[PDB]
């Protein structure tokens, strides 16, 4: 209702860099809020695409941002009569970025990896990797839980079980309040998908440069399955955390599997041991139900609610015709040990090919009425398809079907305005939480400030 659309601030990255593909607010030890921006096609120092991360300090006028440095040199280690190899070309550093405390975690989901042993190899494959940075000290670490040293043959001899070679770890990422980093790796276990968890502290304390294969003993990965429903499900395409078992001592994980069960799609709520607590099934095949997941209490009862996006959902229309518009499903959490039932509200896009529900951002309490609010991206929405972001205020009954406000893209066609969103943080210290929107197609990010 009260995000100011007139006085925008534009931060810009380099041409072709996809600056804005991912973003987050970052708060230093002093308390000063900056904006972390991921730019997964930024050219490295040798004119080869590696991706990058930029740390933007808050200004009303916006502008260019400084690059947060990372090692972009490939590594080789001849150890244990083997040859370990990392490959950072086209790795897409900054395909996801997330901040926790004084740490920034930026991931390269497509960083490739290989192991050679005489005439055999593991196969050069995208295990992915995350780089961890602590700006105020300069410390750097890495986490790459899917790297192995098993040769191609052994996988074949074991019917490709526990095959983590194509994980793409860090495809999605979230961090708990306690400091556990959770990575989505939708290529895990031969494209079933997996989750990797490890405490940020332990990632830092177990990392040394040049080792490439090391142990993080506190880490916890999800499991492989021979259940065909899970095959090619891309479990971990999106990830999120919240409270869903009424036990504040334990944290629950929300996982998106948009092609689960022959493209039916699914989202699962799990405990921290990866035991399924509930499964929400998609409504329509190929709708990509689970592309986006958001957790936030929207009806003011202090129980986290679940929001799922299906951006390729096709709506029924007159004379048996279907129209790709996208849908968002709201699930309100009930009391006790009771399951999440059917959707309390379906929000459906209105522009053809708009991809409404491609991103869902909790905004916190935007208007300060007591109920939390959300924004929902339609990256190709609006009458001219340039992109659109729609604000929905919360209420006792859940959310309103009608948006309180609509933000039209200020960028040209193809910008993918809204493809990434983040809220719930007051960047300018005015007492109201603001909204950062990324338009990776236009290599920019737009900040919207909430006003009284």
């Amino acid at each position: 209702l009260n995000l100011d659309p007139v006085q925008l601030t534009f931060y810009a990255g380099p041409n072709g860099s996809q600056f804005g593909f991912s973003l987050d607010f970052h708060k230093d030890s002093h308390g000063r809020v900056a904006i972390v921006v991921g730019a997964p096609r930024t050219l490295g120092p040798s004119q080869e695409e590696t991706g990058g991360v930029f740390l933007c300090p808050w200004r009303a006028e916006g502008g260019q941002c400084p690059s947060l440095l990372f090692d972009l040199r490939d590594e080789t280690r001849n150890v244990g009569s083997q040859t370990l190899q990392t490959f950072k070309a086209r790795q897409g550093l900054g395909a996801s970025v997330v901040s926790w405390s004084d740490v920034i975690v930026a991931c390269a989901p497509w960083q490739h990896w290989n192991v050679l042993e005489k005439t055999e190899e593991a196969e050069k494959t995208p295990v992915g990797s995350c780089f961890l940075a602590q700006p105020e000290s300069g410390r750097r670490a890495e986490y790459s839980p899917c790297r192995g040293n098993t040769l191609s043959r052994i996988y074949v001899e074991n019917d490709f079980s526990w095959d983590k070679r194509y994980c793409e770890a860090g495809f999605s990422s979230v961090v708990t309040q306690a400091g556990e980093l959770v990575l989505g790796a939708p290529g895990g276990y031969y494209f079933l998908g997996l989750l990797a968890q490890a405490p940020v502290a332990d990632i830092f304390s177990s990392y040394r440069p040049g080792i490439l294969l090391w142990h993080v003993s506190s880490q916890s990965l999800s499991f492989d399955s021979s259940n065909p429903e899970y095959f090619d499900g891309y479990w971990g395409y999106s990830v999120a955390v919240g409270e869903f078992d009424g036990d504040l001592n334990t944290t629950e994980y929300v996982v998106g599997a948009p092609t689960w069960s022959w493209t039916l799609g699914a989202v699962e709520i799990l405990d921290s041991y990866y035991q399924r607590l509930h499964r929400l099934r998609g409504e329509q095949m190929a709708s990509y139900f689970g592309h986006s997941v958001a957790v936030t209490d929207v009806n003011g009862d202090g129980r986290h609610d679940l929001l799922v996006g299906a951006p390729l959902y096709m709506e029924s229309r007159a004379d048996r015709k279907l129209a790709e518009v996208g849908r968002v499903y709201l699930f309100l959490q009930p009391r006790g040990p009771h399951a999440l039932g059917a959707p309390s509200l379906l929000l459906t896009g209105t522009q053809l090919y708009g991809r409404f529900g491609s991103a869902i951002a909790p905004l916190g309490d935007l208007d300060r009425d007591g109920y939390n609010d959300i924004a929902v991206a339609a990256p190709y929405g609006g009458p001219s398809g340039r992109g659109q972001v729609l604000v929905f205020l919360g209420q006792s009954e859940g959310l309103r079907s009608r948006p309180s406000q609509v933000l039209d893209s200020p960028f040209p066609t193809g910008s993918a305005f809204g493809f990434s969103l983040r809220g719930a943080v007051d960047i300018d210290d005015n007492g109201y939480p603001d909204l950062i929107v990324g338009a990776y197609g236009a290599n920019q990010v737009a900040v919207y400030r909430a006003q009284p």
Partner: antibody, heavy 119, light 108 residues
Framework: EVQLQQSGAELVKPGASVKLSCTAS????????VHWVKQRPEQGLEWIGR????????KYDPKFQGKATITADTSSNTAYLQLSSLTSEDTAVYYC????????????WGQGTSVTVSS | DILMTQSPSSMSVSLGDTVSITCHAS??????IGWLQQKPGKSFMGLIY???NLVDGVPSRFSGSGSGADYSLTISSLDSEDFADYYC?????????FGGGTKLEIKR
């Protein structure tokens, strides 16, 4: 606290077998490679082999191929070394070992098991 | 197999000295070298992994260095507890191989 707890001293006879054990404490045995090492006053430290207790796959120094069999059991969090066809050369102290962080390193060591081969 | 030649086999040193034990590999092992300590009648404790990284808990007075086929362990300002045996192990290639050992002994 990570700690490797080996089985007690062995007095065995030449031509017989013996099976030493090494049990994980404060961690799970499948977490890393587990190695076995031989020490003798004169000849010094010799690497015998290793097991990946998650999947059972092993590697040996050819010097011990045939004599040594390394196994592991994740049920009991224990790794074993079995020596067949015992001789006076097998009189030594035997250690199980694992890395701290680096997959390939040799950082944490058991207290050692003493084996005396004698008629 | 890679041969690890450690030097010296013993040295007579005093409290507060700074000493170095060298280890020569028979081929390049690119820092895939660990250093171990065995105190009298006791078992082994790891000191350094991958050439220069101290194992958790190990005192800062221990340091590692080198490259290619030639490495060193330096103990700055010796302590009573530091009169022990020390060994290098390479893990560049299986089979892992060990140095002969260096014994630190008290000068009198």
């Amino acid at each position: 606290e990570v700690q490797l707890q080996q089985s007690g001293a062995e007095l065995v006879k030449p031509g017989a077998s013996v099976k030493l054990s090494c049990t994980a404490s404060g961690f799970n045995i499948k977490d890393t490679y587990v190695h076995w090492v031989k020490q003798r006053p004169e000849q010094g430290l010799e690497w015998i082999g290793r097991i990946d207790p998650a999947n059972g796959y092993t590697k040996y120094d050819p010097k011990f191929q045939g004599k040594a069999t390394i196994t592991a059991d994740t049920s009991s969090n224990t790794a074993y070394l079995q020596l067949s066809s015992l001789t006076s050369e097998d009189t030594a102290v035997y250690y199980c070992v694992r890395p701290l962080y680096d997959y390939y390193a040799m950082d944490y060591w058991g207290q050692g098991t003493s084996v005396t081969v004698s008629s | 197999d890679i041969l690890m030649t450690q030097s010296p086999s013993s040295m007579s040193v005093s409290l507060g000295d700074t000493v170095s034990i060298t280890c020569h590999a028979s081929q390049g092992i690119s820092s895939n070298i660990g250093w171990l300590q065995q105190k009298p009648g006791k078992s082994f404790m790891g000191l350094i992994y991958y050439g220069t990284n101290l194992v958790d808990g190990v005192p800062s007075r221990f340091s590692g260095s080198g490259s290619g086929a030639d490495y060193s362990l330096t103990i700055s300002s010796l302590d009573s507890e530091d009169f022990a045996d020390y060994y290098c192990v390479q893990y560049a290639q299986l089979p892992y191989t060990f140095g002969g050992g260096t014994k630190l002994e008290i000068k009198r």
